C-alpha cells in the first residue's frame, strides 16, 4: 500500500520563525538580530523580569497541586485581564457583557476565534491590513475563513492612508470581521489617532461589521492605558467585539503562552450563551490553558507590590525603545545615509518599517550578517549601543 | 443591524468537565469524586510529585531567558519521548524514521495530528473504539472528519470482543485511520494481550490502515516498557503511524500541557517533508508550546537520580491504584451486594466500567453525593480508606 505521507510537499519556511532558524546557524560572530519581535535589553539578552522571577518563587513554594484549571483557565486571570482592556469601571463589565477564556498565546487566542465563528456563525470573511502579521491569514485560513485585505499604509509618505482605509473598507460587508491591531501595528508601527479610531467606530457600527481586536503590545506605545483607547472607544458604541490579547511581550513571557480571548455581546445572556461554544471549541483543540504563565501574569497583576514593579519594568522597556529610535536616526546621518530617515521617530512599538528592499534585506544577510524580515520590517527593539555602529554602516553600504 | 451571535446554540456541558463543575457547586458534606481521571492519593488530595518539585527548583534557579521554543518544542524532549515510547535501541530512532512536537497535552497532540492529515492527505475517516474518551470524536470532528466507531467491550463478560472488534472493522479502508489506545483503555480498563495486538498489527498492515496511538497512561497497567509492548508490535511491521501522547497523568503534570505527537515515516527524507506541514500547522494554531511543563519533563527524564525518583513515585501511584481494586471489591461484598465485581481486579489504569445504568449513576450523584461518569465510568484512583465504605453503602443502596 503506497503510504499515507509519501505525496506531502514540504512547508516553505515561516517568514519569521524560518528567519530566526537561519539566524541560530550562522557561525558569524558578529551577527545581529532585527528579526523576531522580541525585546532585548541594553546588553542584547532576553531577560526574565524581576517581577516574574518573584512570581515563580512563589508559585514554587505556595503550589500544592497541578489539577486541571476549567477550560476557560484562571477566573482572576480573566477578571484582571478586562480591567487592563476595558478600564476599573467600565459598563462592559459591570452589566456582565464579557467572558475571557485564559489561551495559549494571543496566537492561540486567534485561532479560537476563528474556530468559534466559523463553526457557529454565518462569518465567511475576514479583513486584515496590507500590510498586516503574516501568520495572520494562516490563522484563519486554518479555521476555513476567506482572508480580505484593506489598505493602511502609504510607502511614499511613511504614513496611515485613512483615506485608502476607508474606501477599502466600504466593500466589507455587514456580517465580516474586520480585524484592527489596538496599538503598535505589526508591522509599520503606524496607529490611527483617537479621533480616526472614534471615525472607525462610527463606521463600524453604521455598517454592522464584527470588530476583532489584536493586543498584543498593549504598553508599548504610550501607556497601559493609553494604548486602549481605541480599542475602549470601539468598546462604548458596540453590542459585538472581540479582543484576542497577548502577555508574551509585555511580561516577556514568550514561551509560557499566555494569552486571552475576550468575547462581548449585547447582554449577558447572549455572551453566556456564546461563550459556551467558545469553550466547546477549546475542548477540541487543546482542552484547557497552561497554568504557569498565567499564574505569573495572574499573581503580578493581583499583588500591589509586583504589580509597581512591573509597571515600572514595562515602562523601561517602552522608553528604551525609544532611545534606540531616535540614536538609530541620527546615526545613520552619521554613518553617511543621505536619505531622511525621520519617519521611524513617528513610529509606535517594536517594529519600524524601513523602507529598505527585498534584495537591500537579503544583502544585509548574506554580506553584513545582519537579519531582518523581508518586508524590510525591522526590531528597534534589538538594537543597542554596541551593536548599532556595525548595523548602520552596514544598511548605508547597501543604499 | 441584528447580531451576530444571536442565531448561536447553545453547547452541552462536557460530559466530564461539566460533572466536575457540578461536584464544584455540591455543598453537601461528604460528597465524593469518582469523575475526572486523575490521581489521588491515599488522603484525597491532588498532590504534586517530589520529583517535579525538585525540577521546578532547578529551573527557576538557571533559567535566564522566556524566548520562544521552535515550533516542535524542546529537542531533548523529543529525544526522550521517542526512547519511552519505542525503547533505547529502536531501529525506528537509529533510521531517523520518527519526529516529535511538543505539544500542549495529549489533547493537543491529537489536534494537531488531526489538522496536519485533513489538510495534507486523503485521509477522510477515522475509527474509534466504542466506547471511547467522549473528546476523541470532538477533535477529529473540528478537523471536520468523519469518525466512525468500532466494537470493543462485551459488557456481558466484562471483557475485550475480539470477535466483535475484528468484524466491526471489516469496513475500515486502505488509508482509513484506526484509533487505538496504547494501555489502560478509557473508559473501560481492558486492553488487548500481547497476542492480541500482534493480530492486530498484522491486520493493520495488510488492510493499510493509518495506526494513531493515543498514549495517556503509560506506566499505569503493568510498567512503562511493558506498557508499550503493544505500539511497538505495529512499529516493527508499520510503514506510517502517529503516537499522541501525554505527560499529565504519569507525571501529575495536568494543568501545564505536556504531551507530544510523534509522526513515523518510511524514511528520513519522507518524515522530514511530513514534519514540515505538521509545523505548519502548529503555527497556524498556537504559534509554538509551552515552555514550564516539558521543561520539568526533559530534566527528570536526562537525569538519572530525578528519574529514579520519577519511576518509584509511579510505581506507588500504580500500586495505590491496584490496592483500591481489591478493597472496592471486598468492601463491596461486606457491604452486601450480590452482583458480583471481580471484573475489576483484572481491569487497567484509573477507571472501571462499573455496569451502573444512567439512572443508577444519577441516584448516585442526587441521592449520596457520589459523583461518576454517566457512562457508568468510575475513577478507582478517587478512593480512599476513608470514603471506601460510604461509596460502597451508596451503590449498593441503588443496585
Ligand atoms: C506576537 C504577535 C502575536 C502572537 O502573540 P503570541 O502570544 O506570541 O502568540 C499576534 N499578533 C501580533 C500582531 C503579534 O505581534
Ligand atoms: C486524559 C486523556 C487525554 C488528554 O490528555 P491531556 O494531556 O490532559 O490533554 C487523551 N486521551 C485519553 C485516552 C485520556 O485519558
Redesign the pocket.
Known amino acids: 500500500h503506497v503510504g499515507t505521507f509519501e505525496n506531502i510537499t514540504a512547508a516553505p519556511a515561516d517568514p519569521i520563525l524560518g528567519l530566526a532558524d537561519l539566524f541560530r546557524a550562522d557561525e558569524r560572530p558578529g551577527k545581529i538580530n532585527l528579526g523576531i519581535?522580541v525585546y532585548f535589553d541594553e546588553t542584547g539578552k532576553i531577560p526574565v523580569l524581576t517581577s516574574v522571577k518573584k512570581a515563580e518563587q512563589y508559585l514554587l513554594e505556595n503550589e500544592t497541586t497541578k489539577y486541571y484549571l476549567g477550560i476557560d483557565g484562571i477566573p482572576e486571570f480573566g477578571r484582571c485581564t478586562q480591567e487592563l482592556l476595558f478600564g476599573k469601571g467600565s459598563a462592559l463589565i459591570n452589566d456582565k457583557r464579557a467572558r475571557t477564556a485564559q489561551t495559549?498565546?494571543?496566537?492561540?487566542?486567534?485561532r479560537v476565534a476563528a474556530d468559534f465563528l466559523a463553526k457557529n456563525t454565518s462569518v465567511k470573511r475576514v479583513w486584515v491590513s496590507n500590510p498586516?502579521?503574516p501568520?495572520?491569514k494562516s490563522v484563519f485560513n486554518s479555521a476555513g475563513l476567506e482572508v480580505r485585505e484593506y489598505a493602511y499604509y502609504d510607502a511614499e509618505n511613511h504614513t496611515l492612508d485613512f483615506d485608502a482605509l476607508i474606501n477599502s473598507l466600504n466593500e466589507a460587508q455587514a456580517g465580516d470581521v474586520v480585524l484592527f491591531?489596538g496599538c503598535?501595528h505589526?508591522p509599520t508601527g503606524i496607529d490611527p489617532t483617537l479621533e480616526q479610531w472614534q471615525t472607525l467606530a462610527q463606521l463600524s457600527v453604521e455598517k454592522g461589521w464584527l470588530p476583532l481586536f489584536?493586543f498584543?503590545?498593549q504598553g508599548f506605545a504610550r501607556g497601559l492605558e493609553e494604548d486602549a483607547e481605541g480599542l475602549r472607544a470601539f468598546a462604548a458604541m458596540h453590542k459585538e467585539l472581540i479582543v484576542?490579547s497577548?502577555?508574551?511581550?509585555n511580561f516577556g513571557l514568550?514561551n509560557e503562552?499566555?494569552?486571552a480571548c475576550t468575547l462581548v455581546a449585547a447582554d449577558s445572556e447572549t455572551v453566556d450563551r456564546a461563550f459556551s461554544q467558545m469553550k466547546a471549541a477549546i475542548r477540541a483543540n487543546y482542552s484547557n490553558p497552561p497554568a504557569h504563565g498565567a499564574s505569573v501574569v495572574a499573581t503580578i497583576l493581583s499583588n500591589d507590590a509586583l504589580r509597581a514593579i512591573w509597571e515600572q519594568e514595562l515602562t523601561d522597556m517602552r522608553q528604551r525603545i525609544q532611545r534606540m529610535r531616535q540614536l538609530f536616526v541620527n546615526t545613520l546621518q552619521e554613518k553617511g545615509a543621505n536619505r531622511d530617515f525621520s519617519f521611524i521617530i513617528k513610529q509606535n512599538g517594536m517594529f519600524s518599517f524601513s523602507g529598505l528592499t527585498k534584495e537591500q534585506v537579503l544583502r544585509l544577510r548574506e554580506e553584513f550578517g545582519v537579519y531582518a524580515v523581508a518586508s524590510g520590517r525591522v526590531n528597534v527593539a534589538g538594537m543597542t549601543p554596541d551593536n548599532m555602529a556595525p548595523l548602520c554602516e552596514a544598511i548605508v553600504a547597501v543604499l
Chains 1, 2 share one sequence.
Open positions: 519581535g495559549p498565546g494571543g496566537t492561540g487566542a486567534l498586516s502579521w501568520n495572520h491591531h503598535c505589526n489584536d498584543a503590545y484576542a497577548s502577555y508574551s511581550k514568550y503562552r499566555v494569552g
